[PDB]
Amino acid sequence: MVTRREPAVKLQYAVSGLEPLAWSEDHRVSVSTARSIAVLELICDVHNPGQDLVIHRTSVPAPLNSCLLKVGSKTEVAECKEKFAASKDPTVSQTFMLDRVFNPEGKALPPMRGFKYTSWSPMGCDANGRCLLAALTMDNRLTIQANLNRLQWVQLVDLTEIYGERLYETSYRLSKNEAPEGNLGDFAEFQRRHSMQTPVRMEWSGICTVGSVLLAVLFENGNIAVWQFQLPFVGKESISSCNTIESGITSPSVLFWWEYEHNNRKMSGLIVGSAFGPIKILPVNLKAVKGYFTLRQPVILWKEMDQLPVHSIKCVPLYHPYQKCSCSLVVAARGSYVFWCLLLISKAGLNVHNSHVTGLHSLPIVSMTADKQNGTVYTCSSDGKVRQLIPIFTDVALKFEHQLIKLSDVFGSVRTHGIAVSPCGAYLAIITTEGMINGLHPVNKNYQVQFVTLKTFEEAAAQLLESSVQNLFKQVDLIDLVRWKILKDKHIPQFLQEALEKKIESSGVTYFWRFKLFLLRILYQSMQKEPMEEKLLEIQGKIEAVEMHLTREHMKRVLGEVYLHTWITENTSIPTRGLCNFLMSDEEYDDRTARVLIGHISKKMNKQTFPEHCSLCKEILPFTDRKQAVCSNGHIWLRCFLTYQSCQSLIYRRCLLHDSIARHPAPEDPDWIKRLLQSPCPFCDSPVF
Amino acid sequence: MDALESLLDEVALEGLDGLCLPALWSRLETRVPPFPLPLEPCTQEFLWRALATHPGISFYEEPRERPDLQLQDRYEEIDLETGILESRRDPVALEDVYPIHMILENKDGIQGSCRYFKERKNITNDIRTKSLQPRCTMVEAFDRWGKKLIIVASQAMRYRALIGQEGDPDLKLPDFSYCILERLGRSRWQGELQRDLHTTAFKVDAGKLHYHRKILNKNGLITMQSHVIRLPTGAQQHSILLLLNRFHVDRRSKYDILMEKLSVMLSTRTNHIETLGKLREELGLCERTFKRLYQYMLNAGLAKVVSLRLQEIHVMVRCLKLLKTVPPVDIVFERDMLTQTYDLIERRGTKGISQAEIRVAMNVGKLEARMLCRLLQRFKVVKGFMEDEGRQRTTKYISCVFAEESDLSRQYQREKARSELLTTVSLAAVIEEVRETYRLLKRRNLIIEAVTNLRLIESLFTIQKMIMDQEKQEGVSTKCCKKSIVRLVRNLSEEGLLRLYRTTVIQDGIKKKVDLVVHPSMDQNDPLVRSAIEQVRFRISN
Amino acid sequence: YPFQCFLAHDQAVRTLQWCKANSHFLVSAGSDRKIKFWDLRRPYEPINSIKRFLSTELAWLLPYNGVTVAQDNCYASYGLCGIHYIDAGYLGFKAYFTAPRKGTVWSLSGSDWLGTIAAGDISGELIAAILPDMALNPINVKRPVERRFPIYKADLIPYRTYTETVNHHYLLFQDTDLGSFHDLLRREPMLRMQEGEGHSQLCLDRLQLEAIHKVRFSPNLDSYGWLVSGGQSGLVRIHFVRGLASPLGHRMQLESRAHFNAMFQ
DNA sequence: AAGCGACTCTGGTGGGACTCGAACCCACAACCTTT
DNA sequence: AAAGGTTGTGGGTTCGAGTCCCACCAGAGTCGCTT
Ligand SMILES: [Zn+2]
Ligand SMILES: [Zn+2]
After folding, report:
1. Which of A383, B17, C69, C209 yields a CA-CA distance of 20 to 30 A from B44?
2. Residue B150: strand, helix, or coil
3. Neighbours of A545 (CB within 10 A)
4. Residue A588 burial (10 A CB sphere; 0-12, 13-18, 19+)
């Protein structure tokens, strides 16, 4: 099952920071590196025959200016820094001069502007339908990044800048009665004012219901700042609150969100793990949203303080077959071991079980990933071992069974600096480096990202047919396995065709028509893009037929909403009569529901024309055809594939696959089409941006 | 690709030198795949607004009006014999629109060629507001500035246009290597020939262009092909074709398409044999073309020369038959690296070891092995002998325990002494007078012997042939180049150990280069060189 | 089994020193010829990596923020090989060239009590050197040679393997008068050392029987002025650097004796 | 005067980039080369 | 008699070597001000 996928991705700069590889729900892979964040965007390319992974590459630049954590007045801090560095005590003086938090830049110190950590938001956080990237530098600049156009990442906000000012405005006191304004000239208070705002790691919540998302930032002193962002996130404008909770955990290493549901009651908390070993779930006692609620009291998952640093945390929702109820499985990397804890609400409240699955590695675990759909864990160490670790349900709680996957057999002797798993578990991505060659060191070090197939084509095909999520973009990594097979064998495997026809016959929801359209477009590319010409014409005819079907279903739904809201007698933003004419144009499709709907509409429609005009002419556009409109002067305007209005604006939206086009919403548009314009592309479910 | 993006892409496929407005329309009209719009005057205003409203596009006035573009189409794409020839058919090499003037060491990191980069002025804020609203129509802009209006895409857009979506933006290139890539980009589907880049674009040594092209091959930004130039001589020249990956198309060749037909013919003929005449007649080919195809098929190893009697095909008839070191050192804890490297070199002993072979044996970087060799030479514990093998004058290193007794030493010392003898024996139609290693001294000595024993020698070929046989008797696998000899003969000329005399003689309507070499004791007026000229002219006579 | 491990070097990590003044910090050097300073709270990136020549041992003297480094000579420029003090980076001083050495310095030891450093060479010479107060910029140290002296040099005197060397040579140990450093730069051991530095050529046709492999100052306040060293000969030699022992050391030894004798009886 | 801490002034080497010298290769015309 | 494999040519390709030259280094010198 595990075999390499063809393109290795070369990295220009050293891999950098904590747990440096991640794979977003949006199929963008980020590697945090000394001079950038490289982002690898996986495209199920339907326009080319190449069997490789089509990886579009972008990067976030490293900052040009080093970040100073604000601890006082610009002069007050300067005299303090002189005092400590000049101190004749070896301890005070060397503690100041060695710790890079106090010294983010210097005369002979390398600048720490590369990236410490990165976290991907859920989808829908961006101004487009996409996810945001939270990025942390090693000089503690925490920033939120988005790729609004395709080409260039822009910083939306710097959260360290805001939080520094908000601490300064409260004299670094969280409760104003609780502490003095301690003198900055005391090294303990000086260190504290740095420690209280040095971010360790951060994680996004799920989407809270108007949408909202939280971001929890963990600080070295055990404070956590819970940011609340309004969605879509557009900058400082969307920051609805910041609230700091004092965890009290000493030397906190890692953070993750716990979110859980039982009896449709929502609950949530923050799980936090110390570098000194223990793991605890905090109740998030403060939040503004009304639909969620929070855990009542902290629960201790591991108490031992054995100083095995909790390097990573992941958790997955599960349904336990024998307890016959939903439960949450937590897995945490602790040194070379995996700690696991299963959390199960019952009539007793929380029932909790835990263990260490042991003997996995002879070196500490350098990265960990959870297969969200199964709880399959992967774990990795710099000796190049990767171990697949399968949760098996037990009459109470779990057992874990595990196996090594031989990267030696696919890449040879290799070092692995990180792993990530695709959102459906289709691929494992690995940061490979030159390994020890028969006990010799490699002379030259070159980081790469490499991919291996975790699933067979037959399992990817089956899981797409039985897909509960029923959106192709949620499953680009599975349809890429299907794509690879079709391009490799230049035919659609018969069992997939037969099963898909059975689904289209027995269910026929537009997801299966979208899946058919994908297979046929990849088939067309496979056969070199006159029996071959006859076959090309045949399957292109089939593509056009199913492409036409998906169009009718969308047009029917649009008119099936024009009929429901107040009649737009001015015909303001939809070519209603043109669409009615287009639907009535043939008797070939018998669907009475459309034919009566256009009856009711055409009864209600105004006798005034309200035609669409070509802006270069102020002459009518007839609405002859799906894709584009033309006028007597010969201008050609594309039509918005969501609303069929002509995209005459100098900027308009394009699908991720460029298979489809959409208009930008305007203030003249009613709310209901401003919502309609947020639909994914009707042909490929990709963001239309 | 979308029409609006195809506009901005075309603006970004010119380099930092950018476009004039009439050049832009010419680029859109010549685009492949075809530009979707009819490009009417109203459309040109719409596209002009699409430029002005785009924040990455920027506009300049240059000090002088730019020339308009030629018809760029490089290739013939026709033949009168079977098939067609897509060899380069040369347009007039008019004054280049985009002469190379590299923007070196730029502090903002923007790169490319622009002859006016320091001299042109920004007029963005004249053409648009800072709110990106267009201030001028296209007709107003072209009326006000004409060809002096220059459109340039941002560096981020320009570099993207060179690497495509799969390319990595983090990759910095040297300015010279970027300007090669940029020079490819503006050529679109018809890449520049490497010959032409060094000859007339960059005006550099072919070694310089190759060297700077290496990084583009290493990162894989460009694709390499052999390509064919049909000269007005009627003869046709080999040269490399460089295509930026976006624009790669596998170019065919007349001999390639015709050899496929012969390969198909012979492979479908169940004997895999046919006579040359029928192989010609089935393709209508002349013998002059076909004999290339025959010898290509032979040199490709696909077929074998065969002859059969006509009664065997059913008089002997010509036919074609188709048919198709040093061990690694374990570093010890207990000795320094200089000691351990010397221990290696003593183990090799009389044969020595090279710096590159030390590096692989010691598992060290290139700069690290270099310092090991430098120090051991300076300590006088190891001695370095040059050795020519392959294309490379390497050094082999031998410890002073063995260095004197080494074959490299003994052979070098013999040829040094032999050279000292051969030098010290020196005496105290229109001719023109021209301006260490063991094998190099052997070649020098052999020439000095020849001019000592034969005070004239009639051509550089005669020098080469004896040298080639002499080295072949020694068993040398490499074959001595003409340029190596003529550069060697130049060295002896500057040492004054010979004269080389060159001219072209003319006879019976044909011309011959003479390239006489003579002992320094005679000048071009000597009856011997005159006799040589006459006897060359005799044998050149009809 | 360990609680923490991290990949400090891309090649064998030959030497560690752990910071005394604050044990959150550690330094390591490896045969990638980098010196890397670490913050053990934050092991993912070093505080400072300085690429240098290949190094054999490090010493971190308590009062000074930087580290003094002993080099293997195989990559140093001829005449610039030796021993360097290197600031960890905040003060930003250039490396201070405390002593030129021709051979590789195999081993190094900093006396915290003396603030001096001692170093053993394949030349078979043991030197000591006094560092300046490295809170102050070393570039003002206009003549560092006044701050170093030899302890001894071993010479082979005629008389690739041990028996063939031992049968035909003996070790002449030449010892300095460490009783005082008067007229130091005119005394023959300094001239002998100064004619060694820069000009002398390393010998590779022998076992290196004279080479010194370890050097250690006493960490104890009692005997603080004593040094031990040993090498390829398997001889081990002890020296008292009488000139650096001092009344404050006696003053402190007696007061510490009194306090100790009061605490334990 | 004798002394000090910047501020220079002077010979020497390496780091990466790059000139260098060589063989190797095209395709043609010359014709030596063969039944 | 009656003709083709065999070869030399002008120019481009290319391959790994040693070379370049600037910045940096270690030492010695200068001298405004102090002691
Ligand atoms: Zn029109
Ligand atoms: Zn689409």
Report:
1. B17
2. strand
3. 12
4. exposed
